[PDB]
């Protein structure tokens, strides 16, 4: 399909402008959520939303709204890099670069050396999205805890000495920094 652009943390007035500029310059379809066709995520205020996180996981451009303003002014979609939100999200340019250099379809390898994980059904952010993030960044998620050495999110079941019980933020901070953060900083009781 046509590449998609996703807005996040975008106030109403700014959404209007983005929609109008895309209608003028073409080249994109606006989607509500980051998905496999998404190449650009535009943020109105640099907050770590799920769309930002999925954007990083997929190696999208994660950009300030000003990219749209200057593209309008100059009459075409201009270079993205000057507007990339690398100060807030260090991994953004790293995954974006990896993705653009990938021969086959891009998939991150951040969690490739981690053991099997199980994500709590009660996780925050929501389990389906959190599992997607782990998978996109090279991790392995089992649908049952029996096989997992890492359990992420709320867990009131029987705990084992052979398992690490971590918060969801271990996953998110790792993705944001492009490095596996220390698990002991994220112990969840």
């Amino acid at each position: 399909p046509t590449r998609t652009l996703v807005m996040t943390s975008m106030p109403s007035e700014k959404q209007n402008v983005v929609i109008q500029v895309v209608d003028k310059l073409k080249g994109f379809s606006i989607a509500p959520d980051v998905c496999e066709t998404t190449t650009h995520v535009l943020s109105g205020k640099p907050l770590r939303t799920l769309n930002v996180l999925l954007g990083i996981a997929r190696g999208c451009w994660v950009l300030s709204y000003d990219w749209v303003l200057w593209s309008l002014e100059l009459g075409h979609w201009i270079s993205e890099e000057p507007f990339e939100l690398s100060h807030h999200f260090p991994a953004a340019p790293l995954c974006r670069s990896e993705c653009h250099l990938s021969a086959g379809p891009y998939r991150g390898t951040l969690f490739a050396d981690q053991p099997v994980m199980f994500v709590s059904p009660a996780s925050s952010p929501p389990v389906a999205k959190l599992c997607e993030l782990v998978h996109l960044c090279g991790g392995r998620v089992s649908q049952v805890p029996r096989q997992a050495s890492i359990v992420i999110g709320p867990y009131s079941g029987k705990k084992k000495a052979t398992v690490k019980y971590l918060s969801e933020k271990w996953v998110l901070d790792s993705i944001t920094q492009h490095k596996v953060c220390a698990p002991e900083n994220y112990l969840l009781s």
Partner: peptide
């Protein structure tokens, strides 16, 4: 959208 929630910030996480």
């Amino acid at each position: 959208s929630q910030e996480y």
